[PDB]
Amino acid sequence: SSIKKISFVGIFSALATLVMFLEFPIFPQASFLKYDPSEIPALIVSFLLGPGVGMFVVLVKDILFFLMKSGDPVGIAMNAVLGMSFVGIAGLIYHRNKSRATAIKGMIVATLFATAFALGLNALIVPLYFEAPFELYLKFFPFILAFNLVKFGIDSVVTFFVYKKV
Ligand SMILES: Cc1cc2nc3c(=O)[nH]c(=O)nc-3n(C[C@H](O)[C@H](O)[C@H](O)CO)c2cc1C
């Protein structure tokens, strides 16, 4: 209820900023791809309060996380760009047919989109970030694909066993 909800968002984003400190590289080769489950707070916020609010959370989350981990602008900007895209799409699908069907149809789609958005993004970033030629990206390609497919897929199914578990 306005003031009651502003605080709810504020502590959930500050909750996600916390969870972002258990980030681990999962892939030993790809030390740049690091998994954190902080996209599960925003996915919950996006379902209750709307797609724009969910992106606001991951936006402020990564800003705070960047203020505390000052030294990864492009990486954090990548996580913010991919993160905002994951929740806003999942929020939008859920948000015209309250039917629980749109909950998973949005997560299946959002997981696929954010995965595709990551490959296209890294295509002109992994060359630029490592100041390398385009072939390095292609060495990393199946790991970038498997990562964001697993990261957002896990976040999709974990948020579902949160709604289930009630
Ligand atoms: C080159 C680079 C590529 C990244 N690619 C992805 C990605 O494909 N999917 C994802 O979820 N996060 C990705 N990240 C997010 C990363 O785990 C997070 O931003 C770390 O905080 C990097 O500092 C990427 C980060 C960098 C630096």
Ligand SMILES: CCCCCCCCCO[C@@H]1O[C@H](CO)[C@@H](O)[C@H](O)[C@H]1O
């Ligand atoms: C609007 C109310 C929503 C409920 C919020 C309670 C906490 C967040 C939901 O799940 C939790 O998230 C953590 C971080 O990702 C996980 O580590 C943890 O295992 C899991 O239990």
